[PDB]
Design a binder for this molecule. Structure first.
Ligand SMILES: O=c1ccn([C@@H]2O[C@H](COP(=O)(O)OP(=O)(O)O)[C@@H](O)[C@H]2O)c(=O)[nH]1
Ligand SMILES: O=c1ccn([C@@H]2O[C@H](COP(=O)(O)OP(=O)(O)O)[C@@H](O)[C@H]2O)c(=O)[nH]1
Ligand SMILES: [Mn+2]
Ligand SMILES: [Mn+2]
Lengths: 297, 297
């Protein structure tokens, strides 16, 4: 549940925090609005696991596998079983136009998977964008009654290392791996004022990735509905934002600041970007794909 | 109010966060449980002021002025008017055995003061300790219906610099200025197992000061009631914790981790400790006093 039951941590033995030693010297670990930026070295997972297990936390994970992207499910789910929220209650929600294509992946105790059938749009842009509507449609259907937090990710990915309760918070976004070191004017925000996703050149905190966001069910409902409604205004006006759902996500998180930000450890592409010294772990990574082949019949 | 009304920030122009530049190189700015540690340089007050003003936030400030400590009220309140939550709604709650001794301090718009008459205990230790019971007694009386957050401080103090909405969170404690650089075994926790405040030598995150804590009304109610109930168990067992309410506060915050920690900028004694380089601002500081004289007839 969320809202903090009154509970007490047990005695624990762990290293004392070091007030006069920074946990990272190379990166920003807190935003200007006092949201943690989650990097390895910022958290003691044992403390966090205790806190969230005592609250009996259930995490939902949404993933869309539409048309040829069903091919990504087996590795996605296998690796989620190794690395995502292990020890906590997990409910996977696989949205697909092909239920019979969902692989039979063996789940650990306390973990379940539901298949949600949805329609397939022709254009990959529309498939990607309509995730906001579909996630918002399923808050009342399932999520409010089944999970405490939702984590909403791309399927063309694999887990390689721990992704756990350190991410959980009312609202989070993830630093896009292409832009974490970039100046805001280089961010690929929507720059046309005729779109609802428009962000001027002198605004913006971060460039968040569309492939990994989440929060409490309430906050995810708000985000997804807002982004969908904004998309529909754009469609009525004959404009499609340059990066689709990601552009609208960025507008939303500029205006509604996240309560945690995940570092690019949580959203990476090793083929394109290697393994920089600033990433102590590569947690959730792109699986190589040929856009043209996989997005079209 | 608290619980986040759906609201949007206006357009704002401010410096871009620097992902690859730490906001402080000299101090820890986030705890191992991902609570911000509030130091100058960690926050953009303009963003935070927007967030909290859009939620129409009201902050209660409790202060006890019992027996001779009424002498501290005028400077406390005058300086709070200059530095505490300016621009936000504030409700001061002055607990005293002498209502006629509360000075007539001129308040800014949107700020009010209530005088709450309470009994005076003989021993200063009991006066200090019984604040927990009294704060807890006033959650149902006033606070739940009047304020969003409570800030609970010593009176023998003055504000010298900004203390604002950067502190606000469900539950906060403050690093005691005598111990922020100390190892845990040097912390003056209660070390006798026969007290409810007992903390073993291999446990503890920080040594929090009894003179400055707070949070949402709900969380402050929980803390104060727990500390009072623990005090009463100790009294029945013929033991008084070594540092009184501070010892019980430390036990509570070990077991129930705060969601922000304030640096010693927020609780300082310049006479005893000077102005170290690590303090960029001295915000809330001790007023010199002679313990023996001021605590006794
Ligand atoms: O034919 C498609 C196109 C997209 N997607 C979903 O939409 C997400 C976003 O698209 P994609 O991963 O192609 O975007 P990219 O990471 O390349 O920007 C995918 O991970 C899938 O979950 C899908 O299921 N089928
Ligand atoms: O006779 C007394 C003793 C204590 N206090 C209150 O209890 C707080 C804690 O006591 P004190 O400041 O003496 O503790 P110290 O800061 O010296 O540890 C004071 O700030 C007052 O708010 C009081 O009002 N009258
Ligand atoms: Mn993708
Ligand atoms: Mn004091």
């Amino acid at each position: 549940a969320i809202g903090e039951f009154m509970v007490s941590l047990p005695r624990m033995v762990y290293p004392q925090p070091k007030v006069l030693t920074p946990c990272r010297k190379d990166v920003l670990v807190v935003t200007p609005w006092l949201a943690p930026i989650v990097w390895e070295g910022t958290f003691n997972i044992d403390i966090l696991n205790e806190q969230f297990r005592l609250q009996n936390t259930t995490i939902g994970l949404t993933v869309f596998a539409i048309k040829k992207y069903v091919a990504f499910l087996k590795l996605f789910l296998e690796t989620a079983e190794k690395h995502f929220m292990v020890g906590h209650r997990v409910h996977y929600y696989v949205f697909t136009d092909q239920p019979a294509a969902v692989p039979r992946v063996t789940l650990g105790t306390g973990r379940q998977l539901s298949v949600l059938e949805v329609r397939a749009y022709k254009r990959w842009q529309d498939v990607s964008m309509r995730r906001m509507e579909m996630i918002s449609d399923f808050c009342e259907r399932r999520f409010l009654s089944e999970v405490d937090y939702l984590v909403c990710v791309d399927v063309d990915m694999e887990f390689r290392d721990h992704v756990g309760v350190e991410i959980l918070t009312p609202l989070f976004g993830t630093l896009h791996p292409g832009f974490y070191g970039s100046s805001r004017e280089a961010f690929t925000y929507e720059r046309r004022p005729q779109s609802q996703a428009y962000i001027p050149k002198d605004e913006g905190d971060f460039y968040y990735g569309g492939a990994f966001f989440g929060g409490s069910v309430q906050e995810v409902q708000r985000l997804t509905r807002a982004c969908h409604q904004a998309m529909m205004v754009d469609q009525a006006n004959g404009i499609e934002a340059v990066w689709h759902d990601e552009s609208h996500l960025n507008k939303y998180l500029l205006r509604h600041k996240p309560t945690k930000v995940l570092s690019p450890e949580y959203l990476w592409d090793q083929q394109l970007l290697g393994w920089p010294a600033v990433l102590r772990k590569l947690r959730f990574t792109a699986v190589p794909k040929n856009h043209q082949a996989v997005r079209n019949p």
